[PDB]
RNA sequence: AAUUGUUGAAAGGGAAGGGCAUUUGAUCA
RNA sequence: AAUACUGCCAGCUGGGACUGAGGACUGCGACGUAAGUCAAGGAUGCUGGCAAUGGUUAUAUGCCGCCCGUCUUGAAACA
RNA sequence: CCCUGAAAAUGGAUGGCGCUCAAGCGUGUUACCUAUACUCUACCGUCAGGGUUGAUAUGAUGCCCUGACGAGUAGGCAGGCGUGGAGGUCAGUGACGAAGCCUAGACCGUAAGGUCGGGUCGAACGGCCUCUAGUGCAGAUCUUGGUGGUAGUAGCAAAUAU
RNA sequence: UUGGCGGAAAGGCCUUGGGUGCUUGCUGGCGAAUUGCAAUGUCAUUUUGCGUGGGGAUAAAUCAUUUGUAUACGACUUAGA
């Protein structure tokens, strides 16, 4: 149920990770940009992680898409679903954490009986 | 083509048919080359000599057991000539070495197979004639090899031996081509020409 | 709200693609693709089967037949890409093949949750089959060996090298 | 007959690469029989196959295949380079592949 | 933990060429098993099929002490106690039922090829 | 650099293949003479093939029929330079220097 | 978290760790 | 006369690889006397298989890859 | 061209293997391989030239068209993520589970970061527009606490002896 | 199945007589499909365990004690139904 949106293509599926965090745990696998005079990673030499550019980027067109075609969208009680009446072709409800079962199956209900796709339906349910 | 392609080493030059058959096991074709002793390489006597002794000269200085292991068969040395063009560090040149088996002489189960020659590799075809060349058996007999006579007489025998299995042969292809010569001069001989075979 | 609100939504509404001028023109075939060649097959299940092409089907497919008192090919279509023309030749003249055609072949699209997870010709297809085979026949008769030659199959030996083998 | 064979044996040599950097995303093939470009400019288009084996079974079949095509020459030695689909795990560097006579223009 | 320890030829059969003879965590290790036994017997299981199938050895808090030193200095001088855990079991596995149907997906050319076979076979 | 004197038919392809223009300081490509009459009607010019004319042979207004067309960016020559070492005079053996008629070869295959 | 013990998985011809592409194993809509 | 060499064709044609961006019409052209058509300001038609492709991680393979930060013209340094 | 002149100390350098009508040397001619170089195309960002209140229809700081460019230490400017608090709002979430932690499980964004699935867990917490700062660590022989290789190792040998 | 040759890595080769098939050397008959235009369209070999029949025999080493041609411990060398 989505709509008809070029092929989704990602320059760089990996992610961009620090330079030394596997070497060290003080270093988080969180970008940090290598500001040394004799740095490789900044001297950008062969061999070396990638920094990351303006180059990397995504399609306005096919940006902030989900595989499935549909924007993720946060929602967290029925008056938040009941915004994508009209947008259920883009726009996917997704059910927050801090919401207990007994509003969220009343949110699937209703996003059940308004046809909004939700990212999430297996949440918090009995198995 | 074939699976298994035996080389024989009479009249080879040592460096163009170590590069061939390192190209050859590169690419992915099992090789195995026999009497590695007869190998030829040119230059004079002496001046092997001492390139060998040179190369000798090279050894650990700490401790002689981890230096460079000068080897003094025919057949190892064709090997070290070969290492020395492969990348034996990388796992694809240990799989081309391993691919490799270099023999002195003509082992038993290489006697009764056909052996082929490299036409780019022979002295006889690459050397100007009337140049000094070298033979690796009285090289390796020179520097230290200690097995020269017997595989000498191992190769005599087996001369022996195919000598006789070649007349044998002879006299087979003799009558065969006798029969051929008497099924010639008819129909589907007259037919075969005219298509060629 | 987790998230307060998209301020603008983009607008749910189809747009019709753009006129588009890429017409569509008949298969231009081979020089050597002429009705009535022997055909050798590379691919499917009937390769290296040799057959005759007869009829030039409007799917861009050759009809080809495999005669069955040969090699038991039937009656097909086979894709141009698929095929060796061999430079012999047997004439189809006077071998109807004006009833098949497209939709002669119907595929009759299978069903699709039953699936065969376990465990049928038409005696119009085999009439049909018998009633080219027979003047297929009748006309390969009048030189030699093209039965047997038609029977056996192509393979490629040692030292044969397509780049210098007219086929 | 002994022999059923519908392609053309092909060796996988390496990728095209330079002295320090190598480009997997296109291989090096090697056809037997041929030996300058005029007459390697025959199987141009052709499809390659790489066919092999594991241990475990995927749809029914323990034999994988990977496919692929010829795109141009490579060198004077008949040597042509090669595009497929996925590239080659780069352990086949003198593994035996299956050129296909298809699409025949002959 | 075998640093720059003793060799011996009673530790041969375990293929090591290093062992020891420890004393207080054999008895230590000896009473868990003894109480391991009481318990088991207690709670009914026979001693016949018995066997240690988990054992554990964790560091405890350290005792700390002190020690002197030359030129007037402290350092470090503590124990590294232990907490041991174990559990035996009845030992029983004969069979089991293997794994699930993993039902296969066939090809069309797939079912055709073995419709072939089957018809071609006897 | 290396010049050399050019001829009608490699002057042609030259406007035909990589012919832009420069409208209001930008890269417009020649696809119909229009344009060019619109941005070159004062000076008599209003086809491809008039500009063609005004390059080949210099006239009155050859001055701004050049400065209308952007540089031409070519590639690198289909068949190589021909030489090993292209920063030698032609005389010497390279591409550097003056190579008269001889530079029609080399722009067309760099074309 | 540093550190440590068991279970389950992988690798180990004088280091480990990373990047470019893929096979295989595990897992995933 | 022919041929070698160079340059031209707004002469024809065979084979192979990459790319499919734009989304009712707007403009410049051709065929067609005329309806209408077109390779003409960005690819459509038909058909086949499945309901495996692909994402994360470990190993393996071919290649590359010196230790982070500072001082310095010069750092990885036996600073 | 080659040879004598021409002798230095760990064992080694046209990189080596090796090469002799060379795979050495000078010159002449073709084919072949590649840079983040050149030409085209797809995407991102920046800049420039413009169109678009004749609307229900909102963001003219919005949308669209065309062209060009994209390196970089010190440094400057601009656009954004996150942290502790305060105002307005979501008549926001929550003991049927808020915060926190774990999670080679998944999604979005080039990135800082955000979000979901599961376990532990037990009373608070979040989004939007702003204001405020005791607001982001990888080092400073940085301050405090704890923990590893060394390492079950050195050692537990003066003073006659059990 | 009879015999012979081969020790370098022989582990293979030749040969004698019979049996079991095929024989496309030549001439006929029968079936080939509904695997759908290609989707490797298997039949080869490298180990481990399991199950079925025939066939071959019922052994050593280490620790423990001790010996001394031996030694830091290892290890070497001995012995004791």
Same mark, same amino acid.
Request: glycine residues 6%.
């Given at each position: 149920?989505?709509?008809?949106?070029?092929?989704?293509?990602?320059?760089?599926?990996?992610?961009?990770?620090?330079?030394?965090?596997?070497?060290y745990?003080?270093?988080?696998?969180?970008?940090?940009?290598?500001?040394?005079?004799?740095?490789?990673?900044?001297r950008?030499?062969?061999?070396?992680?990638?920094?990351?550019?303006?180059?990397?980027?995504s399609?306005?067109?096919?940006?902030?898409?989900?595989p499935?075609?549909?924007?993720?969208?946060?929602?967290?009680?029925?008056?938040?679903?009941?915004?994508?009446?009209?947008?259920?072709?883009?726009?996917?409800a997704?059910?927050?954490?801090?919401?207990?079962?007994?509003?969220?199956?009343?949110?699937?209900?209703?996003?059940?009986?308004?046809?909004?796709?939700?990212?999430?339906?297996?949440?918090?349910?009995?198995? | 083509?074939?699976?298994?392609?035996?080389?024989?080493?009479?009249?080879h030059?040592?460096?163009? $048919?170590?590069?061939?058959?390192?190209?050859?096991?590169?690419?992915?074709?099992?090789?195995?080359?026999?009497?590695?002793?007869?190998?030829?390489?040119?230059?004079?006597?002496?001046?092997?000599?001492?390139?060998?002794?040179?190369?000798?000269?090279?050894?650990?200085?700490?401790?002689?057991?981890?230096?460079?292991?000068?080897?003094?068969?025919?057949?190892?040395?064709?090997?070290?000539?070969?290492?020395?063009?492969?990348?034996?560090?990388?796992?694809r040149?240990?799989?081309?070495?391993?691919?490799?088996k270099?023999?002195?002489?003509?082992?038993?189960?290489?006697?009764?197979?056909?052996?082929?020659?490299?036409?780019?590799?022979?002295?006889?075809?690459?050397?100007?004639?009337?140049?000094?060349?070298?033979?690796?058996?009285? $090289?390796?007999?020179?520097?230290?090899?200690?097995?020269?006579?017997?595989?000498?007489?191992?190769?005599?025998?087996?001369?022996?031996?195919?000598?006789?299995?070649?007349?044998?042969?002879?006299?087979?292809?003799?009558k065969?081509?006798?029969?051929?010569?008497?099924?010639?001069?008819?129909?589907?001989?007259?037919?075969?020409?005219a298509?060629?075979? | 709200?987790?998230?307060?609100?998209?301020?603008?939504?983009?607008?749910?509404?189809?747009?019709?693609? /753009?006129?588009?001028?890429?017409?569509?023109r008949?298969?231009?075939?081979?020089?050597?693709?002429?009705?009535?060649?022997?055909?050798?097959?590379?691919?499917?299940?009937?390769?290296?089967?040799?057959?005759?092409?007869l009829?030039?089907?409007?799917?861009?497919?050759?009809?080809?037949?495999?005669?069955?008192?040969?090699?038991?090919?039937?009656?097909?279509?086979?894709?141009?890409?698929?095929?060796?023309?061999?430079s012999?030749?047997?004439?189809?003249?006077?071998?109807?093949?004006? /009833?098949?055609?497209?939709?002669?072949?119907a /595929?009759e /699209?299978?069903?699709?949750?039953?699936?065969?997870?376990?465990?049928?010709?038409?005696?119009?297809?085999?009439?049909?089959?018998?009633?080219?085979?027979?003047?297929?026949?009748?006309?390969?008769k009048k030189?030699?060996?093209?039965?047997?030659?038609?029977?056996?199959?192509?393979?490629?030996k040692?030292?044969?090298?397509?780049?210098?083998?007219?086929? | 007959?002994?022999?059923?064979?519908?392609?053309?044996?092909?060796?996988?040599?390496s990728?095209?690469?330079?002295?320090?950097?190598?480009?997997?995303?296109?291989?090096?093939?090697?056809?037997?029989?041929?030996?300058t470009?005029?007459?390697?400019?025959?199987?141009?288009?052709?499809?390659?196959?790489?066919?092999?084996?594991?241990?475990?079974?995927?749809?029914?079949?323990?034999?994988?295949?990977?496919?692929?095509?010829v795109?141009?020459?490579?060198?004077?030695?008949?040597?042509?380079?090669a595009?497929?689909?996925?590239?080659?795990?780069?352990?086949?560097?003198?593994?035996?592949?299956?050129?296909?006579?298809?699409?025949?223009?002959? | 933990?075998?640093?720059?320890?003793?060799?011996?030829?009673?530790?041969?059969?375990?293929?090591?060429?290093?062992?020891?003879?420890?004393?207080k965590?054999?008895?230590?290790?000896?009473?868990?098993l003894?109480?391991?036994?009481?318990?088991?017997?207690?709670?009914?299981?026979?001693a016949?099929?018995?066997?240690?199938?988990?054992?554990?050895?964790?560091?405890?808090?350290?005792?700390?002490?002190?020690?002197?030193?030359?030129?007037?200095?402290?350092?470090?001088?503590?124990?590294?106690?232990?907490?041991?855990?174990?559990?035996?079991?009845?030992?029983?596995?004969?069979?089991?039922?293997?794994?699930?149907?993993?039902?296969?997906?066939?090809?069309?050319?797939?079912?055709?090829?073995?419709?072939?076979?089957?018809?071609?076979?006897? | 650099?290396?010049?050399?004197?050019?001829?009608?038919?490699?002057?042609?392809?030259?406007?035909?293949?990589?012919?832009?223009?420069?409208?209001?300081?930008?890269?417009?490509?020649?696809?119909?003479?229009?344009?060019?009459?619109?941005?070159?009607?004062?000076?008599?010019?209003?086809?491809?093939?008039?500009?063609?004319?005004?390059?080949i042979?210099?006239?009155?207004?050859?001055?701004?029929?050049?400065?209308?067309?952007?540089?031409?960016?070519?590639?690198?020559?289909?068949?190589?330079?021909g030489?090993?070492?292209?920063?030698?005079?032609?005389?010497?053996?390279?591409?550097?220097?003056?190579?008269?008629?001889?530079?029609?070869?080399?722009?067309?295959?760099?074309?």
């Amino acid at each position: 149920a989505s709509l008809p949106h070029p092929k989704i293509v990602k320059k760089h599926t990996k992610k961009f990770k620090r330079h030394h965090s596997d070497r060290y745990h003080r270093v988080a696998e969180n970008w940090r940009k290598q500001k040394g005079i004799d740095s490789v990673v900044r001297r950008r030499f062969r061999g070396n992680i990638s920094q990351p550019k303006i180059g990397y980027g995504s399609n306005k067109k096919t940006k902030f898409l989900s595989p499935s075609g549909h924007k993720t969208f946060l929602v967290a009680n029925v008056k938040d679903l009941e915004t994508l009446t009209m947008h259920t072709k883009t726009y996917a409800a997704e059910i927050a954490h801090n919401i207990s079962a007994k509003n969220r199956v009343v949110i699937l209900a209703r996003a059940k009986a308004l046809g909004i796709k939700v990212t999430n339906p297996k949440g918090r349910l009995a198995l | 083509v074939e699976p298994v392609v035996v080389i024989d080493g009479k009249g080879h030059l040592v460096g163009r $048919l170590a590069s061939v058959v390192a190209k050859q096991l590169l690419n992915g074709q099992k090789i195995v080359v026999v009497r590695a002793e007869e190998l030829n390489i040119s230059g004079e006597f002496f001046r092997n000599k001492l390139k060998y002794h040179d190369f000798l000269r090279k050894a650990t200085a700490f401790n002689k057991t981890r230096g460079p292991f000068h080897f003094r068969a025919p057949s190892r040395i064709f090997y070290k000539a070969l290492r020395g063009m492969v990348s034996h560090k990388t796992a694809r040149g240990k799989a081309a070495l391993e691919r490799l088996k270099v023999f002195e002489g003509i082992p038993p189960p290489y006697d009764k197979k056909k052996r082929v020659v490299v036409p780019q590799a022979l002295r006889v075809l690459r050397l100007k004639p009337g140049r000094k060349y070298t033979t690796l058996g009285k $090289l390796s007999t020179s520097v230290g090899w200690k097995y020269e006579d017997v595989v000498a007489k191992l190769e005599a025998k087996r001369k022996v031996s195919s000598a006789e299995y070649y007349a044998k042969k002879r006299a087979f292809t003799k009558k065969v081509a006798s029969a051929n010569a008497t099924a010639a001069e008819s129909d589907v001989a007259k037919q075969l020409a005219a298509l060629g075979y | 709200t987790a998230q307060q609100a998209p301020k603008w939504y983009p607008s749910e509404d189809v747009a019709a693609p /753009k006129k588009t001028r890429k017409a569509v023109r008949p298969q231009k075939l081979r020089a050597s693709l002429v009705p009535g060649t022997v055909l050798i097959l590379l691919a499917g299940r009937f390769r290296g089967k040799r057959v005759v092409y007869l009829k030039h089907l409007e799917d861009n497919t050759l009809l080809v037949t495999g005669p069955f008192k040969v090699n038991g090919v039937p009656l097909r279509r086979v894709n141009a890409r698929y095929v060796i023309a061999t430079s012999t030749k047997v004439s189809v003249e006077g071998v109807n093949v004006e /009833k098949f055609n497209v939709e002669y072949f119907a /595929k009759e /699209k299978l069903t699709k949750k039953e699936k065969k997870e376990a465990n049928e010709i038409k005696t119009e297809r085999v009439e049909d089959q018998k009633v080219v085979d027979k003047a297929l026949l009748a006309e390969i008769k009048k030189t030699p060996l093209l039965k047997q030659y038609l029977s056996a199959s192509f393979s490629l030996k040692n030292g044969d090298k397509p780049h210098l083998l007219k086929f | 007959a002994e022999s059923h064979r519908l392609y053309v044996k092909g060796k996988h040599l390496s990728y095209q690469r330079s002295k320090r950097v190598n480009n997997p995303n296109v291989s090096l093939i090697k056809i037997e029989g041929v030996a300058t470009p005029q007459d390697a400019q025959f199987y141009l288009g052709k499809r390659i196959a790489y066919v092999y084996r594991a241990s475990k079974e995927v749809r029914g079949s323990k034999i994988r295949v990977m496919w692929g095509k010829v795109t141009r020459t490579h060198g004077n030695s008949g040597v042509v380079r090669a595009t497929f689909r996925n590239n080659l795990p780069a352990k086949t560097f003198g593994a035996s592949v299956r050129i296909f006579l298809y699409p025949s223009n002959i | 933990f075998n640093s720059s320890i003793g060799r011996t030829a009673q530790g041969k059969e375990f293929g090591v060429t290093k062992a020891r003879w420890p004393a207080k965590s054999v008895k230590f290790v000896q009473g868990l098993l003894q109480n391991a036994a009481a318990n088991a017997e207690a709670k009914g299981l026979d001693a016949t099929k018995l066997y240690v199938s988990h054992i554990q050895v964790n560091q405890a808090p350290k005792q700390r002490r002190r020690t002197y030193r030359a030129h007037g200095r402290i350092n470090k001088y503590e124990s590294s106690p232990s907490h041991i855990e174990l559990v035996v079991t009845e030992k029983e596995e004969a069979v089991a039922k293997a794994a699930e149907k993993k039902v296969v997906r066939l090809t069309s050319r797939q079912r055709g090829r073995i419709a072939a076979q089957k018809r071609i076979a006897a | 650099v290396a010049y050399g004197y050019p001829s009608y038919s490699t002057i042609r392809q030259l406007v035909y293949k990589r012919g832009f223009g420069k409208i209001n300081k930008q890269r417009v490509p020649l696809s119909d003479n229009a344009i060019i009459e619109a941005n070159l009607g004062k000076y008599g010019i209003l086809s491809i093939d008039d500009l063609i004319h005004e390059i080949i042979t210099v006239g009155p207004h050859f001055k701004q029929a050049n400065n209308f067309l952007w540089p031409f960016k070519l590639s690198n020559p289909s068949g190589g330079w021909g030489v090993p070492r292209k920063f030698k005079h032609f005389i010497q053996g390279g591409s550097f220097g003056n190579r008269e008629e001889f530079i029609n070869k080399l722009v067309k295959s760099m074309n």
